[PDB]
Amino acid sequence: FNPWTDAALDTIVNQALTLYAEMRVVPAHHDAFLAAIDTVSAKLRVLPGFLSLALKQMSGDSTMVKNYPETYKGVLATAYLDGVAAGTQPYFYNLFVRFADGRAARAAGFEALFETHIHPLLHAMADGPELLAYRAVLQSVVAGDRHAIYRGAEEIRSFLRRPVELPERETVTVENHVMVPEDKHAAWEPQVAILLQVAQDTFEPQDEPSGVGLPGARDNRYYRKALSTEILRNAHADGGLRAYIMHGVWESVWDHENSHLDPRFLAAAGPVGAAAVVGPVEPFYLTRRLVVAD
Numbered sequence: 001f002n003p004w005t006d007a008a009l010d011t012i013v014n015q016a017l018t019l020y021a022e023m024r025v026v027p028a029h030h031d032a033f034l035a036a037i038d039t040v041s042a043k044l045r046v047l048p049g050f051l052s053l054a055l056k057q058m059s060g061d062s063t064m065v066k067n068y069p070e071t072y073k074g075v076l077a078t079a080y081l082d083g084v085a086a087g088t089q090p091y092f093y094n095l096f097v098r099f100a101d102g103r104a105a106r107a108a109g110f111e112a113l114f115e116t117h118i119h120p121l122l123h124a125m126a127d128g129p130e131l132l133a134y135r136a137v138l139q140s141v142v143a144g145d146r147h148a149i150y151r152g153a154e155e156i157r158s159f160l161r162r163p164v165e166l167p168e169r170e171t172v173t174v175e176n177h178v179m180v181p182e183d184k185h186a187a188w189e190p191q192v193a194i195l196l197q198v199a200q201d202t203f204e205p206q207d208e209p210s211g212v213g214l215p216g217a218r219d220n221r222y223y224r225k226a227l228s229t230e231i232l233r234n235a236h237a238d239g240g241l242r243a244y245i246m247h248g249v250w251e252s253v254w255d256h257e258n259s260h261l262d263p264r265f266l267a268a269a270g271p272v273g274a275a276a277v278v279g280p281v282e283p284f285y286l287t288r289r290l291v292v293a294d
């Protein structure tokens with residue numbers, strides 16, 4: 001069940017494809033792991049049809065995605081960073097490798113690169129047990145930012161060529177993970193797309209003069225607009241379930257959490273959340289590497 005093999009990759013084509021991994025890395029292997037990612041990204045960036053690569057460290061967990069009462073807002077905002085600072089958790093890293101189309105993805109030989117450079121570092125200490133990675137191939141269904149919604153294959157490629165999450169900007173990424181019944185997913189996708197209009201348009205206070213909003217805080221309901229939103233579908237159903245990630249980038253944890261309290265968002269998300277039979281789980285991430293094509 002490896003979706004990164006030649007054969008798996010043969011089965012898919014004319015749109016952006018993301019090779020995607022969720023990994024755990026222990027401190028003893030961390031420096032080597034980042035060196036390995038840098039070795040791998042140098043090799044990938046020069047390949048035909050390569051768009052971007054993002055390495056994101058899980059930093060906390062959204063509570064407002066669950067619609068807990070506002071007293072719980074942001075209480076796990078930095079909890080994963082704290083686990084690294086306590087040594088109680090490994091590093092959790094997700095990797096996004098975006099290609100122009102299936103031919104580019106297929107040609108890239110990513111599985112080999114991963115096996116050579118990254119796989120050997122994904123073990124605990126003794127040496128110890130292998131920490132298994134989640135692996136997927138993901139399609140970008142629809143995407144958007146503060147100015148426009150991107151629906152065509154080429155418009156979405158272009159969006160993926162200019163990621164906003166440059167590490168030095170200290171943006172906060174969210175990945176809202178859900179599974180929808182496979183027999184419902186086609187009908188559901190158009191409902192999800194209204195979330196991109198909400199993301200493009202909504203902020204608090206609504207009259208903020210720069211047209212972006214004010215920074216969120218624990219003690220207010222303000223927020224700046226999302227920086228970017230992208231709907232990722234797993235290219236392969238998991239039997240009767242289809243996995244999605246609503247991939248968002250925000251200026252801060254508080255902007256995100258406060259966005260979830262806005263009645264405009266709640267009204268639009270209600271119907272979308274109705275079809276989710278697993279999740280939502282929506283962690284926070286910091287972008288540790290961002291690499292674009294040469």
Ligand SMILES: [Mg+2]
Pocket residue numbers: 045046047048293294
């Ligand atoms: Mg090139």
Ligand SMILES: [Mg+2]
Pocket residue numbers: 062065174176256260282
């Ligand atoms: Mg969210």
